[PDB]
Structure 1
Amino acid sequence: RTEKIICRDVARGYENVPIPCVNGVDGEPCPEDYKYISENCETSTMNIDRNITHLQHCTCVDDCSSSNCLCGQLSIRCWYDKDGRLLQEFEPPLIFECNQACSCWRNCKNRVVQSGIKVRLQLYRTAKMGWGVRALQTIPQGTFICEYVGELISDAEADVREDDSYLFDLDNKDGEVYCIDARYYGNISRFINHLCDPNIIPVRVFMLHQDLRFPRIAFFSSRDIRTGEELGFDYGDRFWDIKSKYFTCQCGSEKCKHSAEAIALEQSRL
């Protein structure tokens, strides 16, 4: 079966680079049961706090490469290197990028996520997991890949929705909990599958607002990724504790934690 290219760009030119779709596995048409959006949306009143006078910001007159940068200091247990790659210490990390209140320029060293997708990605048909996303180039460890984009909703709203297959929990620790639901509105991330041996990780980020209800979710590679490799993150135990009643993990890794067999082994262990 020939690998058919069935959409030149599922993002319709909204990203820095196109994200084509191919299918060399079956007859499934390009997915159209969602609306592609490149930035988060709301379908009820969220009213993100964007008061420019309440943004924490820096006064740097350089490129914000120094440890004196306030925005760098606000970042929790992570920092960027000269090439825009993310380094960690590992309480989950938290990135404060520079913003419109900072004295610095738009091209300072603390602007990776807000500058958008730089790597070549592809939406493709997997053998066993439906649609997936893979790299069309080599990607070094620590590289920004893409943002988890979708519809901002309350945890209360998320609990009553019928389909939770595209639901991301922001897990706010101070204040009410919100989610990003990519079921009806989402970007390329909605198609990223779960891997027990993941090669990307989600990281909370603040950029042009610092409304603590709504960290934005950035994926960075957690290791060097090879051309053609499927992208995947660890959805987490909570997802599988719920979903395993319907289906189990097919990531196929020797380290798979969520297969029928793995779950049975964890049960007998407990």
Structure 2
Amino acid sequence: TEKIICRDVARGYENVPIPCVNGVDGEPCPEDYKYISENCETSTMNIDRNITHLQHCTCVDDCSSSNCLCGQLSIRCWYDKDGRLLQEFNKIEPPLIFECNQACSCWRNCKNRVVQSGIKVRLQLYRTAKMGWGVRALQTIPQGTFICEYVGELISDAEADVREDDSYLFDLDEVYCIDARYYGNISRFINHLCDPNIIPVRVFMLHQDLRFPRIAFFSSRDIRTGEELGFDYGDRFWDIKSKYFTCQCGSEKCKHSAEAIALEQSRLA
């Protein structure tokens, strides 16, 4: 039987609660990390927060016209009137998104502020059959909807190079990383799928320091209620981890299962 073990893993820091349930095993709600809703720093990074360094728009409407400078910074604003990615949006090679900011002339409710407005969908941390904890939707989610941000500890690549536990690392684009092992949000629990239903997009909001894009997950297709969320962790992850464990996503397109790995090595010979 599935029981609601924690009413909100985010401790009230998100717009909506994120409960945790486990109907698979005896594992209690995870507590070996610190939930944070926004990225943190553990060393001197000096993110460029100078307000005069922000590119910004002069719109006095809702930023829905093609004349919005912030939209032009990403070719065009990719958000429709409902805050969802346009359907033409390149989900294979996503552009950088520049949302409106505190230097823009527009109001806080304009159409170019989806990610900075936070989580709106109902998500749940749940125990999966084969992959530990995972995150699933508690509602239908149309294609192009903002889900959540990959939040954690900002670290340099040199620091990432010496960290033991690399299971919760997201590479940003000298390069930096978000390590969600010790400090992270709900995204640290999202598993890898070889047939993913969310995609990461690099976004700029209150600063435009190009070393530190913020990573926003949007649905790449319609997601049904109860479906597990997953993104493609990529080849760096799997080149490292395949020798320790194999993919359990179960897709017919799986490239990282024990079977898939074995079939590739057999054709080598």
* TM bracket, shorter-chain basis: over 0.9
Q: Which moved more, 1:83-92 or 1:226-235?
A: 83-92
What TM-score results when the alignment is normalised by the length of structure 2?
Answer: 0.96
**Does the 8 Å CA contact 2:114/2:146 hold for their aligned counterparts?**
yes
Q: Which residue of 2 aligns with 1:164?
A: 166
Q: Deviations over 1:72-126 (max 9, x none)?
A: 0001576110100012656541100000000000000000000000000000000
**Does the 8 Å CA contact 1:77/1:89 hold for their aligned counterparts?**
no
Instruction: Provide the secondary structure at the position in 1 that maps to 2:158.
Output: helix
- Gap change, CA 1:201 and 1:78, over 3 Å in 2: farther
**Does the 8 Å CA contact 1:76/1:94 hold for their aligned counterparts?**
no
User: For 1:96 and 1:118, how far apart are their aligned partners in 2?
Assistant: 20
| Aligned sequence identity (%) | 100
Displacement over 4 Å in runs of 4+? 88-91
1:263 aligns with 2:256: no
Q: Deviations over 1:181-222 (max 9, x none)?
A: 000000000000000000000000000000111000000000
Aligned positions, number: 264
**Does the 8 Å CA contact 2:77/2:112 hold for their aligned counterparts?**
no
Question: Aligned-pair distance for 1:264?
Answer: 2.1
Question: Could you list the runs of 5+ residues in structure 2 that have no partner in the other structure?
Answer: none
**Does the 8 Å CA contact 1:77/1:93 hold for their aligned counterparts?**
no
Aligned counterpart in structure 2 of residue 207 of structure 1, from 185, 205, 209: 205
User: For 2:201 and 2:77, how far apart are their aligned partners in 1?
Assistant: 10
Q: Which moved more, 1:73-82 or 1:249-258?
A: 73-82
User: For 1:59 and 1:41, how far apart are their aligned partners in 2?
Assistant: 31
Question: Aligned-pair distance for 1:66?
Answer: 0.5
Q: Deviations over 1:223-270 (max 9, x none)?
A: 000000000001111110110010000000111110011122233445
Question: Could you list the runs of 5+ residues in structure 1 that have no partner in the other structure?
Answer: 171-175
- Gap change, CA 1:257 and 1:247, over 3 Å in 2: same
**Does the 8 Å CA contact 1:77/1:88 hold for their aligned counterparts?**
no
CA RMSD of aligned residues (A): 1.2
User: For 2:247 and 2:101, how far apart are their aligned partners in 1?
Assistant: 40
Q: Deviations over 1:21-53 (max 9, x none)?
A: 000001001000000000000111112111000
Instruction: Provide the secondary structure at the position in 1 that maps to 2:86.
Output: strand
What TM-score results when the alignment is normalised by the length of structure 1?
Answer: 0.95
**Does the 8 Å CA contact 1:77/1:94 hold for their aligned counterparts?**
no
User: For 1:114 and 1:150, how far apart are their aligned partners in 2?
Assistant: 16
